[PDB]
Amino acid sequence: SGAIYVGNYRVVNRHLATHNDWANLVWEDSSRDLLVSSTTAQGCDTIARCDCQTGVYYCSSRRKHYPVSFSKPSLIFVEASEYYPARYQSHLMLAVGHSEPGDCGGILRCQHGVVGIVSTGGNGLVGFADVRDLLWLDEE
Ligand SMILES: COc1ccccc1[C@H](O)CN1C[C@@H](C(N)=O)CCC1=O
Numbered sequence: 001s002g003a004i005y006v007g008n009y010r011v012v013n014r015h016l017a018t019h020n021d022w023a024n025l026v027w028e029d030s031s032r033d034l035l036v037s038s039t040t041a042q043g044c045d046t047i048a049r050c051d052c053q054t055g056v057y058y059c060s061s062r063r064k065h066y067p068v069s070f071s072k073p074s075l076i077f078v079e080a081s082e083y084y085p086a087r088y089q090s091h092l093m094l095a096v097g098h099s100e101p102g103d104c105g106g107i108l109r110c111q112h113g114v115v116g117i118v119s120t121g122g123n124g125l126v127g128f129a130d131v132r133d134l135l136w137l138d139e140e
Pocket residue numbers: 015033078079081082083084089099100101102103104118119120121122123127
């Protein structure tokens with residue numbers, strides 16, 4: 001589990017969104033595994049606006065932050081889970097790292113700010129849903 005709190009937005013994995021998220025919906029995209037809801041309180045996270053390919057992510061199944069090298073956002077085939085059919089997930093970045101299904105939500109960050117959140121993985125892989133192209137998270 002986990003979310004990004006930027007401005008008056010909450011960014012979560014679409015597959016982990018709550019009823020309150022769906023009842024206060026700003027935007028959702030199944031192909032990216034992302035959903036954004038509105039918040040009453042202002043958040044403290046800042047979004048990175050860059051093309052970094054190195055950063056650090058939080059892994060809840062190890063209580064640890066790991067430094068990683070990761071691929072550029074791409075269209076990558078993801079194996080069937082309890083949330084999605086085997087399919088093509090867009091704007092996904094992969095790295096070598098430990099990951100398990102409850103780790104979705106952990107933040108990946110670079111020197112510029114938050115890059116994205118854990119969305120996939122398995123066999124020493126971890127996939128991150130990028131958020132750096134969502135420029136509207138910085139306003140309104
Ligand atoms: C962190 O992910 C894992 C970890 C260990 C093993 C397998 C995985 C999966 O890739 C994660 N997965 C895919 C998600 C998606 N974005 O399509 C939907 C829900 C899900 O369980």
